[PDB]
Structure formats: structure tokens, C-alpha cells
Design a protein around this ligand. Structure first.
Ligand SMILES: [Ca+2]
Ligand SMILES: [Ca+2]
Ligand SMILES: [Fe+3]
Ligand SMILES: [Mg+2]
Ligand SMILES: [Mn+2]
Length: 803
């Protein structure tokens, strides 16, 4: 084997040198990396030994500190940071040696490597049979593979030319120059390969986390026949303790799929897989894993298309709202796409990179500081690999199957951050998922306002018995008892399924100002009686600055008695409620939700569904057929207050309750530490023929118009709900939108007073104050008649007409 071979080859060196000559960003990375290498080099022979005595030596060669069971990852912080400083110094110097061929760098790097190799071969491998037993980390191979195993073979691959041609290392014990122990290094590389294949979980992200150690140590074997004999155990052969790439790709079956957890956990699997795939296709041009498994790099775009207009992510499960763009993953996915002749990916990835350089989000010449995070050290590849390069729009609807998730977005032409509309609805069974039911979030005014209830500290009472349960989510609880079962630690719920939607995925709508999606969810694991749930949400844009959401939620239990609760949470520090325009009299009801506290919590096993005993400041009205208007006010996000209005129509036959929910981590700072204003609408009996209905609209209190929605009323056909009448006021003028909503694709609606006929599921009619038809939208339907006008639907059962 000619070396280096793993990250780079000798024949690539001038190409890299030329990129530094011709590109400012590359020279700046080179100079920063060189400044780190230089700090580790030594001027004198005594300083050479000093650097090795900085390592966590145990005193013929010394060993290193071993880790069993001021603390980091659960082990003494102090030796680990000495170790990691050493290892990463050595990688940086070994890259500077490749680039400059100055021996001062090779000697620094190989001295450190020699200390690791000579120490490890004296330490017994842990044969207590525990599946995550390691070597230096007697009880954590997973950690060791990320911190140590992946890095030693790289150093070796860069310093090999120096050592094979008579270079020597400083034997720290004797203070003598001595030959590198190549036989001992082979045994280290053999042992980390064995460990990756015979330690760890097989069905998990663990094999991916272990794959840099596996693939690097395979290629540091001195026999090319053995290298090729071992390579299949990354590419496509599994063991009891290791998934191959081919098996990992089964979790990216369809374009648009991602590693099936929450976004924050899912992102790491894409980062690492893209690195490993690029390594393979750089070195072995015939495998073309970037084509065979192009859904893996595609997960970058899949995640991009989930984002809100303010770059935040849907907060489903144990996740975060904001996560830095993974520019290193884009740099390598762009190289992978070039190697594999994938033009759509070339365009997208270079489009994200170019846009982020243009707007100053990505400083391509800035070398990140070492975080000493537990992941393979690949910082130098910024320079060594990234291509000389000489924003993509998100679709109106997106779907993510594993999370049962559907996005509707309607972007403004002007101030998109403030004025765009976006919702997602979802729910399903996956690791780091919640018993969310069929839940949702609502965007407005630069922020996610209708928010998921957040996450707690793992394994705590409030995390398992509130944050992960239904009452923490914008959904319906049925029979006071909606819950979960099986799957991941009894968190399992059924998938949310799409019934209909328009525009369909990755298409343009019939109408630029209208969309809807109807989804359904079986609340099978209810402690009292299963319930069927169905939800219709629509995004109605009135103009480039104003728009609103319609939320219709049906629930029906398989039982002769039932009740249902509709739950909404919204960021704020103030919440006000009126009914028929007047202040509501709410009575304190501190015990309302306390019966679920009688359920016995068994950690990791049984939970106090639905979690609402954790609400505070509980205050309830009477059963009412009056309307309600809730005003949420957030005073601490922007200089002017940000308002969400919720219009609950008359004849909803609900009891209104206001609560303060536990603080939510999905809320923008400083509200992540503040109580979360919330309401519940309780219906006695079924909630299907006359379902929950709410209209949401946001605005910023400097806004000229404030909100355009002024009234919301039910369209009722003999106790059966058929939609809503929304009264708008736009630049002083009154308009009416009739939002027609039926439960069957062939249902026929006749409203004699309005002179309307509609056959279909979802439509929206817009008329002026005199009743003139301005435009009509059929999202899913056959026929519409308003007065003397009649419309028919094209393909897809949708149409839009202006008059
Ligand atoms: Ca493994
Ligand atoms: Ca519905
Ligand atoms: Fe936000
Ligand atoms: Mg009341
Ligand atoms: Mn949640």
C-alpha cells in the first residue's frame, strides 16, 4: 500500500496545493490548521519529550489512563482532555507533514502515535462479554471508537512515509530515539476492527457511530488482501454487532426519508454516513455508493424542506428548534454528488453552499475551533477535500412518513420571515418520539407561536408524565385518557395518515392563496375507549401581509359515553379571553385534571396519561354555545408585541378552560423558561358531527392593519357542521370567506340563504360586502354553485377561479 491512502494520496497533493494558491478560503484554512500544528511542534529535544509527558501516561513503555464505569462522558475529565488534545494535535501535524513535507510535523505526530500504540498493546481487551466493552475504555467501546479508534489509523497513514524511510520516534521511557513498532501498530488496527465487528448494538445508530473506526482501521492494515477481505464488513456484510452501509440504507428507503428519530438525533446519522460514503467513492470509483444509496445524501434536502421561514425546525419529539447548518456535510455531499453524476444533488448542495457564502452564514475560510465532541475528528477535510466552486426554494407541501408529518407552507413575497404562513401536522412511533397524538405547530411573525410543549430532562417525573404525553401537544385528548403502548419504551402511537390534501406533495397548487390537508389518527391505546381522530387544517392567504389558519378536529370514541378535550399551547406572557365580545368569568378549578396523578408511574414503562395534572392556574367557564376569542401576547420577543388570536365560533358546545402549562423548550428565548399559556375546550359527548373548530391569525402590534379576521361562525345544517363563515376586514372593507368542509368526497351541501351548492370535501368561497363572488377554490371536490355561477373540477379534483 502506498501511503497516505485514506484521506488523500500523494498524487492529489499538488491539486490541493494548487487550490490553496488559487483560493483565499483555502489559504486561510491552511494557515489556521498550520497554526495549530505549529503549537504542537518542538524546537529542542527536551521539548519533544515534554509534549509526550503532557499525555496521561501511566508509568517498559508507559500505558495510558484507562477508563472504568470534573467528569466528562462519565469519566475523569482531565486525562481525557490531555489525551484528545494529543490525538488531534497529531492529526493536524500529520496533515501539515503531507502538505509541507517538513519533518518537524512528522516527528511530532509519530511520537504521539507511538505512545498510543505502545500503551494499547499492553492493556488487556475487556473479555467480560458485555457488548459495549472496549479497550482503553474498558466499559465503552462506542465512545473509544469515536475518540481514539478513528484517529490513530489516520495519523499512521500520514506519518508512514517518514517512518518507513528511517524516521524515528522519541521513546518517552528511555529518552532515546527508536524505531516505530510497526507490528504493534498492526495489532492495534486489527483490534479496533475486531471490536467494531464484535461490540455494540446492531439495530441502532451505533454501527454508524462505530464505522469511522472500522473503515479507517481496515485501511491501516499492511496487507491489501486483508484490506479487501475486511471492506465488505462496512459495505454490505453484517454481523451480530454491526450493520453495514447496505443495511443502514434500509432506513432511507424512499427519497425524502431520514434516519427515523427526531430531527436533532437524525442529523448526526446523515453527517457521518455522507462522510463515509464520500471516503468510499473517493477511493473505490466502481462501487458508486453515492448512487446506490442516494437517499442518504438526499436526507440533507429532506431536512432542509422541513424548515420554517425563520430556519427553525418542526419540534417533534426530543429535539431542538435551531441547529447550525451542517456545512461540512454539504461540502462532502457535494463532492459525493459530483463523483456520482447526480445533477439534482449537485445543484441543490452547491446552491445551499453558494447562498450561505453570499449571505455570510458560511465563512468558508474559517476553520472551526476544536470542540472536543465525541465524534470522529475530520476537521482537516474542510481544506483537503472541499471543491473549488467555479437559496433553493421549499415546496408548498412536504411529507415525512416515519413521523406521520405533513407540512403546508405559504410564503410571502415581501418580508417572508414575518409574513409567511406554515403549519405541520404529525404523529407516529419512533425512537425519541412522543405520545403526541395528531399534533401540530403554527408559524407567525418570525416565530413558531403555536408550539409543542417541549422536553424535560430525561428520566424525570415531568418528562415522562407530562412532556412526552398528549397534554403537552396541540391535539385532542379523548375520554381523558389518550395514551401510548409498545414501540419504544411504551411510547408507541399509530401513524397519522393522509386522507386528502391540495396541493399534493412537491407540486404547485390550483391556487397560490389556498391549501388544505386532512389527516386521520387512530387513538388505539386510550385507557378508557379507543377513539378515531380526524383533522383538517387550511392555510388561507388574504394578501402578501395577511393570512390565517383554519383548524377542524373531529373525534369519536367507540363507546356509549365519551368526552373530548382540544388543547392549544401558545408562546406568551399574557393571555386574554372574551365571549360574545365581553370579558369571561372564569372560576378556579385547581383539581380539574388531578385524576391522572393517581396512575402509578413506572419509569421507562408506565405513564400518567394524558399528563394534564401538571397544568397550573386552572380556570374554567361554563358549558357554552357563545363564541370565544383568545388573545395571546408575547412582549419579549421583539420590540413590539407579537399577538396570536384564536377565534372559536358560537355553537361549539364547549367548556373553555385556561391553564399555564410547564415551560416549553420549543419556545423562543426567553420563553423556554417561562410558563406556557394554553387552553382546553371540553366537549361532552361525540365531537364528530359538530367538531372542534378554531381560526388562528397572528400579527405584530406595530402593524397598520393588525388582524384581518373579525368574526368566525359555523355553517350548520341541522346540528351537522358544514364549515365556517369568516368575516374579514381589509383596508377598511368587509369581505366574507365561506370555508366549506364535508366529511365525504361525494357529500352534497345546499345552503338556501347563501344560494350555495357544493359537492365535495373542501372549498373556499370569497365574496365582497355586497355578495359578489370574487374567487372560488375547490381543494378537493366535484362541483360548486354560488348564485348563478357554476364551477367544475379538473384533474386532481381541484380548481381555482377568479371573477
Ligand atoms: Ca459494532
Ligand atoms: Ca375533518
Ligand atoms: Fe421560533
Ligand atoms: Mg364561559
Ligand atoms: Mn413533544
Amino acid at each position: 500500500v502506498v501511503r497516505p491512502s485514506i484521506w488523500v494520496t500523494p498524487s492529489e497533493r499538488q491539486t490541493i496545493l494548487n487550490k490553496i494558491e488559487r483560493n483565499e478560503w483555502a489559504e486561510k484554512l491552511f494557515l489556521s490548521l498550520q497554526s495549530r500544528a505549529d503549537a504542537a511542534t518542538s524546537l529542542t529535544f527536551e521539548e519533544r519529550r515534554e509534549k509526550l509527558l503532557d499525555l496521561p501516561l501511566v508509568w517498559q513503555a508507559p500505558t495510558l489512563v484507562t477508563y472504568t464505569k470534573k467528569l466528562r462522558w462519565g469519566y475523569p475529565r482531565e486525562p481525557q482532555e490531555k489525551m484528545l488534545k494529543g490525538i488531534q494535535d497529531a492529526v493536524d501535524c500529520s496533515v501539515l507533514y503531507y502538505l509541507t513535507q517538513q519533518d518537524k510535523y512528522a516527528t511530532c505526530a509519530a511520537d504521539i502515535l507511538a505512545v498510543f500504540i505502545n500503551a494499547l498493546v499492553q492493556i488487556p481487551v475487556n473479555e467480560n462479554g458485555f457488548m459495549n466493552s472496549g479497550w482503553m475504555y474498558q466499559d465503552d467501546h462506542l465512545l473509544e471508537a469515536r475518540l481514539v479508534g478513528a484517529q490513530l489509523p489516520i495519523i499512521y497513514d500520514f506519518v508512514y512515509p517518514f517512518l518507513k524511510n528511517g524516521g524515528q520516534v522519541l521513546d518517552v521511557a528511555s529518552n532515546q530515539l527508536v524505531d516505530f513498532d510497526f507490528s504493534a501498530a498492526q495489532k492495534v488496527f486489527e483490534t479496533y476492527v475486531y471490536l467494531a465487528l464484535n461490540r455494540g448494538l446492531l439495530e441502532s445508530n451505533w454501527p454508524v457511530l462505530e464505522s469511522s473506526s472500522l473503515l479507517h482501521n481496515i485501511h491501516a492494515h499492511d496487507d491489501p488482501q486483508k484490506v479487501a477481505e475486511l471492506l465488505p464488513y462496512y459495505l454490505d456484510k453484517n454481523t451480530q454487532h454491526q450493520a453495514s452501509l447496505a443495511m443502514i440504507a434500509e432506513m432511507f428507503k424512499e427519497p425524502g426519508d431520514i434516519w427515523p428519530e427526531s430531527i436533532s438525533y437524525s442529523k448526526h446519522v446523515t453527517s457521518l454516513s455522507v462522510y463515509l460514503m464520500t471516503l468510499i467513492d473517493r477511493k473505490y470509483p466502481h462501487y458508486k455508493v453515492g448512487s446506490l444509496y442516494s437517499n442518504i445524501p438526499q436526507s440533507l434536502t429532506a431536512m432542509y424542506n422541513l424548515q420554517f421561514p425563520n430556519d427553525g425546525y418542526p419540534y417533534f419529539g426530543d429535539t431542538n428548534r435551531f441547529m447550525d447548518v451542517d456545512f461540512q456535510a454539504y461540502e462532502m455531499a457535494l463532492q459525493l454528488a459530483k463523483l456520482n453524476d447526480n445533477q439534482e444533488q449537485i445543484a441543490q448542495f452547491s446552491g445551499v453552499l453558494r447562498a450561505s457564502i453570499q449571505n455570510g452564514e458560511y465563512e468558508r475560510g474559517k476553520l472551526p475551533e476544536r470542540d472536543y465532541y465525541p465524534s470522529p475528528y475530520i476537521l482537516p477535510l474542510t481544506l483537503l477535500w472541499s471543491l473549488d466552486l467555479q437559496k433553493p426554494q421549499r415546496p408548498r407541501s412536504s411529507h415525512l412518513p416515519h413521523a406521520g408529518l405533513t407540512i403546508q407552507r405559504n410564503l410571502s413575497q415581501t418580508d417572508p420571515v414575518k409574513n409567511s404562513l406554515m403549519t405541520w401536522v404529525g404523529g407516529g412511533s419512533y425512537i425519541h418520539g412522543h405520545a403526541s397524538g395528531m399534533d401540530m405547530e403554527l408559524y407567525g411573525q418570525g416565530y413558531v407561536l403555536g408550539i409543542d410543549g417541549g422536553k424535560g430532562t430525561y428520566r424525570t417525573d415531568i418528562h415522562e408524565n407530562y412532556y412526552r404525553l398528549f397534554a403537552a401537544h396541540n391535539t385532542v385528548i379523548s375520554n381523558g385518557a389518550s395514551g401510548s403502548h409498545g414501540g419504544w419504551i411504551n411510547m408507541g402511537i399509530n401513524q397519522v395518515k393522509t386522507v386528502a390534501m391540495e396541493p399534493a406533495i412537491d407540486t404547485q397548487g390550483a391556487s397560490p392563496n389556498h391549501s388544505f390537508a386532512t389527516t386521520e389518527f387512530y387513538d388505539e391505546f386510550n385507557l378508557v375507549a379507543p377513539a378515531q381522530h380526524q383533522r383538517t387544517m387550511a392555510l388561507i392567504r388574504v394578501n402578501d401581509k395577511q393570512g390565517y389558519y383554519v383548524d377542524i378536529f373531529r373525534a369519536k370514541s367507540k363507546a356509549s359515553e365519551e368526552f373530548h378535550d382540544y388543547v392549544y399551547h401558545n408562546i406568551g406572557d399574557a393571555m386574554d379571553v372574551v365571549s360574545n365580545g365581553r370579558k369571561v368569568e372564569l372560576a378556579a378549578e385547581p383539581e380539574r385534571y388531578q385524576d391522572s396523578d393517581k396512575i402509578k408511574w413506572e419509569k421507562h414503562k408506565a405513564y400518567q396519561h394524558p399528563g394534564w395534572h401538571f397544568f397550573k392556574d386552572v380556570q374554567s367557564g361554563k358549558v357554552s354555545n357563545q363564541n370565544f376569542q383568545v388573545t395571546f401576547t408575547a412582549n419579549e420577543l421583539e420590540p413590539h408585541p407579537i399577538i396570536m388570536e384564536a377565534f372559536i365560533p358560537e355553537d361549539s358546545n364547549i367548556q373553555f378552560t385556561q391553564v399555564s402549562a410547564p415551560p416549553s423548550s420549543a419556545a423562543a428565548k426567553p420563553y423556554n423558561k417561562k410558563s406556557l399559556p394554553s387552553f382546553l375546550l371540553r366537549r361532552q359527548g361525540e365531537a364528530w358531527s359538530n367538531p372542534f373548530a378554531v381560526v388562528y391569525e397572528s400579527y405584530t402590534q406595530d402593524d397598520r392593519q393588525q388582524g384581518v379576521v373579525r368574526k368566525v361562525e359555523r355553517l350548520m345544517d341541522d346540528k351537522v357542521f358544514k364549515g365556517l363563515k369568516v368575516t374579514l376586514n381589509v383596508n377598511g372593507e368587509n369581505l366574507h370567506q365561506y370555508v366549506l368542509v364535508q366529511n365525504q368526497d361525494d357529500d352534497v351541501y345546499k345552503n338556501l340563504a347563501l344560494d350555495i351548492d357544493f359537492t365535495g370535501r373542501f372549498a373556499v368561497i370569497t365574496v365582497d360586502s355586497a355578495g359578489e363572488l370574487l374567487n372560488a377554490y375547490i381543494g378537493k371536490g366535484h362541483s360548486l354553485r354560488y348564485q348563478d355561477i357554476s364551477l367544475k373540477t379538473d384533474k386532481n379534483q381541484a380548481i381555482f377561479k377568479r371573477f
